[PDB]
From TrEMBL, chain A:
Entry's Gene Ontology BP terms: putrescine biosynthetic process from arginine
Keywords from the UniProt entry: Hydrolase
Classification via InterPro entries: Aliph_Amidase/BUP, C-N_Hydrolase, C-N_Hydrolase_sf
Entry GO MF terms: N-carbamoylputrescine amidase activity
PANTHER family attached to this UniProt entry: BETA-UREIDOPROPIONASE (PTHR43674:SF2), NITRILASE C965.09-RELATED (PTHR43674)
Ranges in a coiled coil: none
Pfam families: CN_hydrolase
Name listed for the protein in its UniProt record: Carbon-nitrogen hydrolase
CN hydrolase domain span: 2-264
Automatic annotation (TrEMBL), chain B:
Protein keywords: Hydrolase
Domain (CN hydrolase) ranges: 3-265
Descriptive protein name: Carbon-nitrogen hydrolase
Record bears the keyword Iron: no
One Pfam family cited in the UniProt record for this chain: CN_hydrolase
Record organism: Helicobacter pylori (strain G27)
InterPro entries documented for this protein: Aliph_Amidase/BUP (IPR050345), C-N_Hydrolase (IPR003010), C-N_Hydrolase_sf (IPR036526)
Amino acid sequence: HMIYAGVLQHAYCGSRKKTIEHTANLLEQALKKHPKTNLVVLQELNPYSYFCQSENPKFFDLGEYFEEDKAFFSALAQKFQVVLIASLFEKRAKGLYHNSAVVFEKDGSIAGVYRKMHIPDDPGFYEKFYFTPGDLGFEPIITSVGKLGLMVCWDQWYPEAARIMALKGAEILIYPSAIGFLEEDSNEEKKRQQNAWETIQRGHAIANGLPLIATNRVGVELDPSGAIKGGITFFGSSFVVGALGEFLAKASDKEEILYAEIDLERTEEVRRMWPFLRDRRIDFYNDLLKRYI
Amino acid sequence: HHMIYAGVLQHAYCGSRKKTIEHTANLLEQALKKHPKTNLVVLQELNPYSYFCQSENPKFFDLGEYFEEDKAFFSALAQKFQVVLIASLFEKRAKGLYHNSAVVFEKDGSIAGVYRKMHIPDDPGFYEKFYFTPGDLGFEPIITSVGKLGLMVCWDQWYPEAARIMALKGAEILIYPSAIGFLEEDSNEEKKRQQNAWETIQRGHAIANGLPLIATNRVGVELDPSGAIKGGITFFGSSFVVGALGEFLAKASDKEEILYAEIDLERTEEVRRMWPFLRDRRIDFYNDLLKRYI
């Protein structure tokens, strides 16, 4: 059981149409450069700007594309016969939206949908205004390349989420992300932010004996409201680690096709060496259900 | 202000209980002369003893008879140097019943609290489930004059759940006396990956909870007295301290070492304002954490 993973890390191209066409070109390039690729993961909200930089209800208009986006990325997955993970903007109902990652099987059928569960809220990342927190919970998505523990961005800071996926048979953890720095940040803070983002996810891999893919976009994006001067600089640096937290591939902070070959069969050997799941003291984990004590 | 001036005593087993604890006392004295501000000293796991779980032999339960003498010895040390002191001891709770128990001594030598190791490993050369009954007190921080200590022991440090529960109960720092080493069979790549994973997962506890973290470890080669494991265990030291962003504040060698770190607990406020993970935890969908597997 092998996953030959491709990560398409790029900038927003100024419109939805141009951006999704650019992603389609990179997918084609990725499959020529790496013909064994059976899983392609896109960045969070891959057709769009990171529109949560400001709190503005006009951006809910972008929710009207969900079915067209799925048709577009469904066709891509079937055309290139890969499992494809897109990160989309789901309109659940009038006035009701989710940050929803969609997994396309290699025949274009939808293997599953994950609604972002943990929703952030900081200046420049006003996601709680737009995204209703997911209500399906932490459920892996079964695909022809394995049972995918798929979550989105802010979810990656929560060990609880990765553990629940692992307990439900996930064979890999995957997080399309949108993370960048502000003009105000010092070099020390940027390095610490990015290193902590990498480190916490490497811990999910180690704790669960599972490999992990994290994707991210690149490029400077300016605040249309003008509140945040210098906008957000997305640092890319998508990466893949194995079941011991060891790096399998690491990207630059520029546009990049990242490739890694992931052996799922190592999970048995890693968990035999480190049987964390055997030893979890679930009889004393009840306090995890509390906000604070 | 609210500062912890932390000292870690990383050393080898000295061939006997008596020599080892006296060696710890001498190192503690050296540490306080070099770092006079020290208000917290953390020892290595099972600090008076060899890592006797390398083999499964019921005679080592005889070591459980020293618990009160060990507590008296390290109580007197904490009182002599007026530091909060964390020892990692071997508790005989009753006939046939033992725990891996870390004990916290207040600066006056009184016992601030006791933590019984919760997660008990069982791997060749690490036969801990044979000796240690799993803790029954749970994950409770221990209140001391230098802060609320989220104290756990060794194998506990691989479990984000335990660190989280401590943080939810107001721990201001996470602390793990450990005993971790490599076997002669391990390649250099495997040895490097093991040690890096051990550090990395603990840095994640610090990040996830916005709390600083201390990890301690012993050094030295210790041979299997039964002869089953050729080459024994080489404990790689590398005690370390990280802050609430996962950043290293101090990192030790693989030799005997007094490691010192100044830890600002007040940083937790600014870190959690920046990274409000606790506000956003989806506790309404965490129920499945209570299952063995699903």
